[PDB]
Amino acid sequence: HMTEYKLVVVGAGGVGKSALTIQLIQNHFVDEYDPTIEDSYRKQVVIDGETCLLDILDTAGQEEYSAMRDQYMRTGEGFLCVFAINNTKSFEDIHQYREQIKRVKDSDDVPMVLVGNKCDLAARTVESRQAQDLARSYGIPYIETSAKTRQGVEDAFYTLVREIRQH
Amino acid sequence: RLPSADVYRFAEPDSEENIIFEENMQPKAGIPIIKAGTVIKLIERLTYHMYADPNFVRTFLTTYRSFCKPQELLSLIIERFEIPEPSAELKRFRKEYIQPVQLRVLNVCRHWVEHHFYDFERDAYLLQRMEEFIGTVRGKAMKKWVESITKIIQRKKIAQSSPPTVEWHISRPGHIETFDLLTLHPIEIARQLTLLESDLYRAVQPSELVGSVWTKEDKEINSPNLLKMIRHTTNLTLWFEKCIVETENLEERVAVVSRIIEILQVFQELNNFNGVLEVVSAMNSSPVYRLDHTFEQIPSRQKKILEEAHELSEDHYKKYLAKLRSINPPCVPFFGIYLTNILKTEEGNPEVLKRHGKELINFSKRRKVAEITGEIQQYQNQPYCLRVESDIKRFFENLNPMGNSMEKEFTDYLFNKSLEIEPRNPKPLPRFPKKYSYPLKSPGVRPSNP
Ligand SMILES: OC1(c2ccc(Br)cc2)CCNCC1
């Protein structure tokens, strides 16, 4: 049996966080997505020559069910803490998301990655250095991604798998 | 023979540059499934001469606002109705094209005012224009449908057997001052919360969901019934956690967790999956999950009940999804799944498909969203055969476990309460005094009267 990594996407709502996972799963050149089927959140990948299965939980749209975060977060081994580079509030919310992840997992060292998403052609309010500084302070990687071009998507996910493997 | 596109836009023939279809046909009607098309071609097919297409009309009128404004739609359906002429040919055209088309636009107007009246409540000029158009419609064949539309508009402008006996425990009828988790009957907590949650579920309209408007800046204006529903659910999870971690005495806290699991058992009986999950979320919260000394003293029967409920949520709601599909109404579904599937359908599919350089509206994306809102509505029809208790109802409606505190403040307080009552190893387990001056024994989940 190949290794299965249970990943959880966390972040502010209303700022296109769903693109990160939709773009990973979708084959480029197919823009047709059905969130109803199993294949929409499970993907077989080869990372550093070792085949594995990524199971990704993204509860995009259920942000108001604030008392369901612990439940959802406990399913994960690895986390993608996502903010929009055009929304400073989503960036500022990362500190509390991470604190909950640490509490839920009962660990100060939980495999985690900071993802800055460029969700539209709105102006950037979060400079690369601000996010690179925050990521360093937590001792975790920082990956910027483009929702339009798929740039950085695979690197975000693969860097998380490496963080889990090297845990 | 139809007139020129230069005089009547809907005469323009079909091509790969203006309308494309799916490989399959409408399951029950043998009609082709439109994949994408131009607004003119979608409006043509909305009011097609060959056949009536209720599914497409139902889908269109639910999801059109993402690609066409209500004013622009009314303009388009008025244009469609105003058919110019291009004898044997003229009499056949009047009967095989003008009469069927004019009738189909009247059915659209009728479906619009009946099922999507909010567009009119929100734009009084849109209704002024609808009424003006409906006034200019003439013909003996139309009068029947014109009167019906007018009858709906004016109605919109105006605006079973015996249920089980209400169950009581320590708290008696009228004595609201003593109502609490352990004093009210576990069966009545579950029934009265099922009624509240059922009504909250049934008040959510597709207008609050289509366009993922509950996630946008104006969510408080556009999705108010959905948010009240989510906020009640959130409040009950937080209330359940608060009850647990504020019962510092272990024996009393074992009694609290055990009673909440009994409330869960009844939510399962009633098919209240929102209620089931309110309890699973509280149990899996950081303050409650870690209470090993409390869960060790919980009866195995109750451990197994909670464990099966938890498993509904496992593997992206696999067992929840199958269980919901198998039961029949009345039930209270968990809305969160629908919310995520609508959002991801809209965000994961393009608004437009391009064919031979021409932009086509992606209708299939919209159909997929209308499929989710239709499944929400199928569970909104049937009510529960349960008598409301106005004082128990009010007690749950006014629960405010957070008080004046903010989310961080409150959830940190709950977690710090958890660490106080059951410290982190190897700190010894302290003892705490009792807070309940009434019996902790449960009356059970089986009704007390036949
Ligand atoms: O047995 C525990 C549990 C099981 C299931 C749920 Br739901 C919530 C908690 C509580 C005690 N600590 C281990 C997990």
Side-chain angles (χ1 to χ4, degrees), chain A residues 2-27 29-167, chain B residues 1-88 92-94 96-139 141-142 144-150 152-157 159-303 305-450:
Chain A
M2 67 172 75
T3 299
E4 188 170 327
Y5 296 107
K6 297 223 171 276
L7 311 183
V8 181
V9 177
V10 319
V15 298
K17 83 170 140 158
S18 71
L20 223 215
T21 304
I22 289 175
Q23 280 203 301
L24 180 77
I25 280 109
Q26 273 183 335
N27 255 92
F29 329 114
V30 233
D31 242 4
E32 199 162 39
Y33 193 70
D34 188 7
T36 292
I37 81 193
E38 172 171 41
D39 291 336
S40 77
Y41 65 85
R42 282 173 88 81
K43 191 191 186 70
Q44 196 175 307
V45 298
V46 181
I47 297 163
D48 302 341
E50 190 208 305
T51 307
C52 60
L53 190 127
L54 308 183
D55 185 280
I56 306 136
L57 179 71
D58 185 3
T59 64
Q62 302 177 55
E63 289 73 30
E64 274 283 333
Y65 286 99
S66 61
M68 299 187 71
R69 282 192 225 98
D70 291 352
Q71 170 156 290
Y72 287 140
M73 288 168 174
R74 216 192 304 280
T75 69
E77 299 165 49
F79 300 80
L80 294 101
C81 297
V82 191
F83 72 89
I85 63 106
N86 51 89
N87 194 277
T88 298
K89 181 53 186 177
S90 67
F91 180 60
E92 288 170 5
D93 293 338
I94 296 294
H95 186 79
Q96 253 314 113
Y97 282 120
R98 174 155 190 273
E99 287 291 293
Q100 296 177 63
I101 294 158
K102 291 195 286 175
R103 179 174 285 178
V104 169
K105 302 307 296 183
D106 190 24
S107 188
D108 293 315
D109 189 43
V110 177
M112 192 185 298
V113 134
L114 180 58
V115 188
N117 189 34
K118 180 178 190 217
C119 56
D120 49 10
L121 264 283
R124 171 188 287 265
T125 61
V126 187
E127 293 311 323
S128 127
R129 189 67 213 268
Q130 288 176 254
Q132 206 77 239
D133 279 345
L134 183 68
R136 176 154 292 284
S137 84
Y138 300 153
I140 65 176
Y142 177 54
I143 307 98
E144 283 201 358
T145 65
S146 181
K148 210 182 80 272
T149 74
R150 228 174 232 82
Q151 285 173 273
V153 175
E154 195 182 282
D155 183 22
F157 282 100
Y158 289 19
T159 296
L160 186 50
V161 166
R162 292 169 193 141
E163 290 291 298
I164 292 167
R165 284 176 179 176
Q166 296 165 20
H167 185 266
Chain B
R1 185 164 84 82
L2 276 71
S4 188
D6 209 343
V7 182
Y8 186 76
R9 296 158 97 190
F10 309 95
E12 190 74 44
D14 295 345
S15 73
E16 298 178 309
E17 307 181 17
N18 60 39
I19 196 174
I20 61 168
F21 303 90
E22 297 290 345
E23 296 302 303
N24 333 285
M25 308 273 128
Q26 293 192 19
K28 307 186 184 207
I31 288 166
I33 300 167
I34 293 165
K35 175 168 175 160
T38 58
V39 84
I40 286 158
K41 286 279 146 186
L42 293 180
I43 294 292
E44 189 192 317
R45 294 281 175 142
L46 186 72
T47 56
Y48 205 52
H49 69 279
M50 280 156 55
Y51 45 83
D53 202 347
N55 300 309
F56 182 69
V57 168
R58 179 152 54 252
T59 295
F60 186 96
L61 289 180
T62 299
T63 68
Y64 80 90
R65 303 153 191 78
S66 52
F67 61 81
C68 176
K69 294 179 212 173
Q71 290 285 346
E72 293 165 18
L73 169 57
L74 185 51
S75 285
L76 257 16
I77 65 168
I78 288 159
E79 203 197 339
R80 180 82 174 117
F81 190 97
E82 293 170 2
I83 304 158
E85 74 278 356
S87 55
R92 179 154 152 279
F93 189 74
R94 293 243 250 285
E96 296 201 337
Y97 201 84
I98 301 178
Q99 175 119 318
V101 172
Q102 286 188 355
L103 237 131
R104 301 277 191 284
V105 351
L106 256 40
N107 187 61
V108 163
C109 293
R110 172 164 184 272
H111 194 275
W112 198 354
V113 296
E114 177 80 291
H115 300 291
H116 304 90
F117 201 64
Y118 57 98
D119 293 338
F120 299 99
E121 294 176 339
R122 296 178 187 179
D123 191 344
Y125 179 52
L126 187 76
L127 189 68
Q128 194 201 297
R129 285 184 64 197
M130 180 55 86
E131 290 171 317
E132 270 171 332
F133 166 63
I134 295 307
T136 70
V137 176
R138 234 77 68 177
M142 314 273 66
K144 183 202 275 238
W145 314 100
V146 169
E147 286 171 55
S148 185
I149 291 155
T150 301
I152 296 151
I153 291 162
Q154 266 52 55
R155 189 225 302 154
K156 296 295 191 171
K157 281 204 208 174
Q160 241 175 342
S161 185
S162 195
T165 292
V166 171
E167 290 286 348
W168 298 94
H169 178 46
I170 296 159
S171 275
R172 283 289 123 193
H175 300 89
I176 68 170
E177 306 84 25
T178 68
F179 286 11
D180 209 337
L181 177 70
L182 297 178
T183 57
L184 281 175
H185 198 287
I187 294 168
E188 217 47 51
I189 289 170
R191 291 163 167 178
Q192 297 302 321
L193 281 173
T194 290
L195 286 167
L196 276 167
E197 293 166 31
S198 183
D199 287 340
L200 287 166
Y201 178 73
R202 296 169 73 202
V204 179
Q205 295 304 313
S207 68
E208 299 179 53
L209 304 164
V210 179
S212 306
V213 295
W214 79 88
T215 71
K216 317 268 185 71
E217 64 180 11
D218 292 332
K219 62 182 163 150
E220 300 290 348
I221 296 153
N222 291 308
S223 306
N225 300 290
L226 181 78
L227 302 164
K228 276 153 185 169
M229 183 275 301
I230 302 173
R231 288 163 184 160
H232 162 96
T233 300
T234 296
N235 257 26
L236 266 292
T237 299
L238 291 175
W239 182 63
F240 287 141
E241 291 177 34
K242 193 192 172 104
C243 288
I244 297 154
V245 305
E246 290 189 342
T247 298
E248 307 174 29
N249 179 268
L250 179 52
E251 170 163 60
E252 291 185 328
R253 199 171 48 260
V254 161
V256 167
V257 167
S258 166
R259 199 73 59 97
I260 295 162
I261 298 161
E262 285 180 327
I263 290 152
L264 163 65
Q265 206 190 328
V266 178
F267 284 150
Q268 291 278 34
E269 279 165 23
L270 295 170
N271 309 316
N272 182 0
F273 303 107
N274 175 75
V276 160
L277 277 147
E278 279 169 356
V279 174
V280 177
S281 306
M283 297 304 178
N284 268 295
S285 69
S286 281
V288 186
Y289 189 86
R290 65 175 300 283
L291 304 176
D292 301 329
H293 300 100
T294 300
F295 284 87
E296 195 81 355
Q297 267 55 81
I298 290 292
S300 309
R301 174 164 116 99
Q302 293 187 342
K303 294 204 188 85
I305 291 164
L306 178 57
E307 182 191 320
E308 295 321 288
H310 174 67
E311 287 168 15
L312 292 175
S313 81
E314 289 183 347
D315 308 315
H316 298 246
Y317 287 110
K318 188 167 160 69
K319 291 178 176 165
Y320 164 70
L321 289 164
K323 191 172 180 170
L324 183 62
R325 234 180 302 103
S326 83
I327 68 91
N328 279 316
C331 72
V332 187
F334 169 63
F335 230 108
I337 292 153
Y338 297 131
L339 295 190
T340 301
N341 289 337
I342 289 165
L343 181 69
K344 290 183 178 166
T345 292
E346 292 185 348
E347 285 180 11
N349 293 291
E351 290 278 81
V352 140
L353 304 185
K354 291 206 74 188
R355 289 290 181 283
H356 310 291
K358 306 291 172 184
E359 286 194 334
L360 301 194
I361 294 153
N362 184 14
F363 198 78
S364 272
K365 168 185 194 177
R366 277 80 177 189
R367 170 170 311 105
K368 284 181 211 172
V369 170
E371 283 177 7
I372 303 155
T373 62
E375 188 187 331
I376 295 163
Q377 294 178 291
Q378 83 184 30
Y379 297 114
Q380 300 189 313
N381 298 329
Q382 195 78 40
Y384 283 84
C385 193
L386 288 168
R387 202 185 313 281
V388 166
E389 208 301 337
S390 282
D391 284 325
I392 297 167
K393 182 180 148 71
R394 197 172 315 103
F395 173 82
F396 285 112
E397 290 191 317
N398 303 119
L399 283 181
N400 192 26
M402 284 179 67
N404 305 128
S405 304
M406 304 294 107
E407 203 203 303
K408 204 197 135 56
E409 230 190 310
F410 189 63
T411 53
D412 280 356
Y413 161 70
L414 293 180
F415 195 70
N416 291 331
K417 263 278 163 218
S418 175
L419 295 167
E420 185 194 356
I421 70 184
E422 287 193 32
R424 228 190 287 261
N425 287 339
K427 287 180 156 182
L429 179 69
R431 297 186 177 84
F432 298 85
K434 293 193 107 74
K435 66 188 276 157
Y436 303 127
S437 62
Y438 49 77
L440 306 175
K441 197 223 204 314
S442 167
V445 297
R446 228 88 296 284
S448 309
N449 311 280

